[PDB]
Each structure stands twice: as structure tokens, then as C-alpha cells.
Design a protein around this ligand. Structure first.
Ligand SMILES: COc1ccc(COc2ccc(Cc3cnc(N)nc3N)cc2OC)cc1
Length: 294
């Protein structure tokens, strides 16, 4: 609504930092407790920054305050009373989707020492996929371009609820999923289309390509896209027109949906609304009802 345009400010007393979650692109990310909003939250910090860096922090808060949807990680507001500056987000119960997918994969089931996890079902994969596509419909409606859509950037809550966020990790500290394109910028090439790699053009359509890769991650239980390849080999495949293989178990319509995300020409890719409609329909016809363990 119109009120979400205005950033909510939070009192410093109401935030208690607990532990570091990882190094972010502009500062440390912490698990914290938040009172009068106790609940667990994740906070992004900005320590002893310049005037321009603090200006950018408020501009990012003004962007996020207005992105509020059922399938978008909740932004609660900021605290700029002291140093560091703090951005507050919800801390989801079941962590990141990439870890979740791997924890429910055939290998995790086979290697479990005690009580095994349940292998993620096709119905559960469809349910996760439709929620991510729903969040992407919302972000496109807001003219927001994500640029780093991947399962590691999705979070899982209770009742297999899934939301899209962006941890915004330091790409220099954690370089596994990033490549220094042109020797200049760290970018997530394995999830990117040819125009984003070659011309650094990011749009709703390059996010659609990434969504296709996220569907591939879901149906492969969180495997790294193009895991058989070096970064330079990945770039050669993407720019030449080779595609990720069909997951062992995937509805054929779902693999064809992925292929539709991977059209070389951005304007010829499947439209986000259509992707969401198809996944929503498949998920409703194969609902989630089995218990999920481990
Ligand atoms: C564009 O809309 C956006 C909405 C939210 C965000 C912030 O995203 C995040 C902010 C913090 C975290 C950290 C985090 C880790 N584990 C769990 N369990 N919950 C968390 N919170 C993860 C995030 O995304 C995966 C970025 C963009």
C-alpha cells in the first residue's frame, strides 16, 4: 500500500545482535533478536561508512520498504540511531532453499547415520517452484530486477512456505558461485543468460532465464548448475546455446518450461505470468500432503 513507501525505523534498544551469519557485500550479516516488532531476525550492517555509502543504504531501504509480498522475504525496516547502520529482515525457520534441497536429496537419504530425512517429492518440488514464480511475478510488476536469483537466495519457512530474498554475500569472500566477468565484476554466470554475461544487460527477461536455472536446481535436489564444468566452460556453453540436462525425475512439461526460459533472445523467453500460471496449475493438481522429515 501507499504507507509501505515510507521506511519503518526501529529503536536500537529493540535489536540484540546474536551471531554472525556471513560476510555481506557491504558489511556483516547477523542473526539478531528483535523486540516490539521477541522474534529472530537477520540484520545487514553498514559500519563506519562514508556519506555516499549511508545515502546508498537509505536508497536501498526505500526500495525494499515497498517490496512486500507473500513470497518475498520480509523487510521490517532500519535502525540508523548508531553505528553500524542496521537493515532488519525476517529470519526464516528452515534456512536457505539450496541447503534444504540438498538435505532432502537421494544422497542425504542414503548417507543418514540415524533417522533419515524424507526425499523431496515431485509434488513438493512443484509447490516450491510455484511460490518462487509467484514472487517473481510480483517483482516484475514492481519493475524490480533481481540479478542473483538462485535457490541459495530463497528461504524456507513452516508448511513448505518459500520466499525470495537476496543475502547479498561478499562475492570476493564466497566466490564459488561467482565469476569475475571481464576481470571487473563478480557475477553469477551459472544462472545468467548470454546477454548478461557478454553485455552486462540485466532485465526481467534475464531473471526469467535464472528462474529456469532455479527450476533445474529444485528438480536436481540443489545440485550446482553445470557442476561438471569450469567457469570458462560454463560461459562457452551458455553463449554457444548448449543447455542444462533434463533432471532425472522432472515432469516433461516442467523441463520444456525451463527450455522456454532459456531462449537466446530475451524477448522470446516464456513470460513470467505464464510460467507462474503453469506451475500453479501443476502444483494444485499434485498437492503436498506427506510428512517431511530431517
Ligand atoms: C528484493 O527483495 C528482497 C527482499 C529481502 C532481501 C533480503 O534477503 C535476505 C536477508 C537476510 C538473509 C539471511 C538469512 C539467513 N538464513 C535465514 N534462515 N534467514 C535469513 N533471513 C537472507 C536473505 O535472502 C535469502 C533482499 C531482497
Amino acid at each position: 500500500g501507499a504507507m509501505d513507501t515510507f521506511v519503518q525505523h526501529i529503536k536500537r534498544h529493540n535489536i540484540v545482535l546474536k551471531r554472525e551469519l556471513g560476510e555481506g557485500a557491504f558489511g556483516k550479516v547477523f542473526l539478531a533478536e528483535c523486540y516490539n516488532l521477541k522474534i529472530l531476525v537477520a540484520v545487514k550492517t553498514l559500519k563506519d561508512a562514508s556519506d555516499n555509502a549511508r545515502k546508498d543504504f537509505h536508497r536501498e531501504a526505500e526500495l525494499l520498504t515497498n517490496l512486500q509480498h507473500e513470497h518475498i522475504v520480509k523487510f521490517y525496516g532500519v535502525c540508523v540511531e548508531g553505528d553500524p547502520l542496521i537493515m532488519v529482515f525476517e529470519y526464516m525457520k528452515h534456512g536457505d532453499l539450496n541447503k534444504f534441497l540438498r538435505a532432502h536429496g537421494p544422497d542425504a537419504v542414503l548417507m543418514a547415520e540415524g533417522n533419515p530425512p524424507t526425499e523431496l517429492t515431485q509434488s513438493q518440488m512443484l509447490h516450491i517452484a510455484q511460490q518462487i514464480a509467484a514472487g517473481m511475478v510480483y517483482l516484475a510488476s514492481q519493475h524490480f530486477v533481481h540479478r542473483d536469483l538462485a535457490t541459495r537466495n530463497c528461504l524456507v519457512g513452516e508448511n513448505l512456505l518459500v520466499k525470495i530474498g537476496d543475502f547479498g554475500m561478499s562475492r570476493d569472500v564466497y566466490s564459488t558461485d561467482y565469476y569475475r566477468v571481464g576481470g571487473h565484476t563478480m557475477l553469477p554466470i551459472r544462472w545468467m543468460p548470454p546477454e548478461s554475461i557478454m553485455y552486462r544487460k540485466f532485465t526481467t527477461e534475464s531473471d526469467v532465464w535464472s528462474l529456469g536455472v532455479v527450476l533445474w536446481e529444485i528438480f536436481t535436489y540443489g545440485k550446482q548448475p553445470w557442476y561438471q564444468l569450469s567457469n570458462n566452460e560454463v560461459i562457452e556453453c551458455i553463449t554457444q546455446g548448449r543447455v542444462l540436462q533434463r533432471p532425472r525425475t522432472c515432469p516433461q512439461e516442467v523441463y520444456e518450461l525451463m527450455l522456454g526460459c532459456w531462449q537466446r533472445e530475451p524477448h522470446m523467453r516464456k513470460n513470467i505470468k505464464g510460467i507462474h500460471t503453469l506451475l500453479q496449475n501443476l502444483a494444485k493438481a499434485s498437492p503436498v500432503y506427506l510428512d517431511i522429515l530431517g
